[PDB]
Amino acid sequence: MDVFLMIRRHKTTIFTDAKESSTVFELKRIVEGILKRPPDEQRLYKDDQLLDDGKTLGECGFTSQTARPQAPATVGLAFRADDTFEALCIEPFSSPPELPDVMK
Amino acid sequence: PNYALKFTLAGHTKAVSSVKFSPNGEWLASSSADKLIKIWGAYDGKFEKTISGHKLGISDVAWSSDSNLLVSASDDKTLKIWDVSSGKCLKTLKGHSNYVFCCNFNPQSNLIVSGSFDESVRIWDVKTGKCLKTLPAHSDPVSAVHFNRDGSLIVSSSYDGLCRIWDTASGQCLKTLPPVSFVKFSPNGKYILAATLDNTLKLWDYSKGKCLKTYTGHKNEKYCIFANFSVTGGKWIVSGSEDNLVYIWNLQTKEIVQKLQGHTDVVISTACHPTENIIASAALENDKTIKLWKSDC
């Protein structure tokens, strides 16, 4: 069972896949491939909850049923830079317009 | 001949399957896909009555020798017998496992024979309704079943492309002579007239077993079209045609001697009046009508 993720920090959003059986750590090394920051500089979250590096994605609640290609699960990302820690901050997407009269 | 249109009967609301003249020359019966049998005056084309019962559309009608009874053959798997005076279903003849396509009383008119999509030929008792014999006739649908002059034989035709003669008495296949869309015995007794779906009619001496005549020029590839002998005046072969015409051949010389125009769909049934030079003809969904044609010979 594969999982499908958006990794989101500030105004960047990564689309990538993993296994339920992957660890948070091995997903920090995927993010290292992309964003070129080591796993000691990353903290990944789900909602508010800091995810531990030894639990699988599955154990963190990320299942084939809740992390689909057409509806991926959101993973928050905040970095450390030496003695400086940023708090998770995700800029929300734009809203659409109010739906038009003929679509009601 | 000079057959010209005289009457047009437009009663059925769906395609017309079969038209038969009564042996007493008095009546024309029509069966239709609209589930109804309708009786017509043969001479003045007058609406006599509607007969209802079948739960699906009807495929063939046949008169008894005494003109008092009809057999119908239906998609609803039933053959039913009717008193023609009343409109009243005397019997229902269950036995076939699929659509029943053809039917005919024996000359004695105490038997009925029928053919079905179930690939079988059945023989029935008119008094009781007991199916007597079920012949394992073909390996494909039966298109026509007819009794001979003294009612001792049966001819059948099928989509296996074979035509076959049965000894009524036992049920043995006496003889076996593209699909065969239609088959029947000549009045004079000796011959058999058979249509194939290669646009062809053929006359056979069933005893000797060779083909003596071939009638072409009409269109016959999909539908099972009913063909006839007319012999009141001259001797003709009559047939419907998918090109919407009624064809007439000099029986002996094979020449087309007339084509009757009027029908606006496949003409699927022709009938030749018993004592007089009259033809009935019936067409399908775009037409839905019966036409009567009266000639000088």
Binding site: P100, V102, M103 | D140, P141
Partner: protein, 147 residues
């Protein structure tokens, strides 16, 4: 050319609706014309009587969106072997995003009103070009002439 042949050779088939659409099975008769059959609700299946050499395709019975069957457009029963029915697995295709976006808008908007959407005339005509089997049957006849 794209039509059922009248083999008269029976074949037991399982119409298996593995889509979220209400499916309409559609038999191509002997002259190539499409005949509607009874609808299958989603996540249902049905043993049904057909014949060898016959042709089927399947659609959303409500909008006539096309569906796949055993990974392809057309289904053709063969002879049952060893007493085994044949499975027609009705599947969704991967619609293009555009095609899907049209499906959704079509179902939200009465066609007497497509043109009160503020979008290019191009999209109006894409909207109005409702799916139908005959257009597809035509398209599919022609790819087989390249193939």
């Amino acid at each position: 050319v794209l039509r059922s042949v009248n083999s008269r050779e029976p074949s037991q088939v399982i119409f298996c609706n593995r889509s979220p659409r209400v499916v309409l099975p559609v038999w191509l008769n002997f002259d190539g014309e499409p005949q509607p059959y009874p609808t299958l609700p989603p996540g249902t299946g049905r043993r049904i009587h057909s014949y060898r050499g016959h042709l089927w395709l399947f659609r959303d019975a409500g909008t006539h969106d096309g569906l796949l069957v055993n990974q392809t457009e057309l289904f053709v029963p063969s002879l049952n072997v060893d007493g085994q029915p044949i499975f027609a697995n009705i599947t969704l295709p991967v619609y293009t995003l555009k095609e899907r976006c049209l499906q959704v808008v079509r179902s939200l908007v009465k066609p007497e009103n497509y043109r009160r959407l503020d979008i290019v005339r191009s999209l109006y005509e894409d909207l109005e070009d409702h799916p139908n089997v005959q257009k597809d049957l035509e398209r599919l006849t022609q790819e087989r002439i390249a193939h």
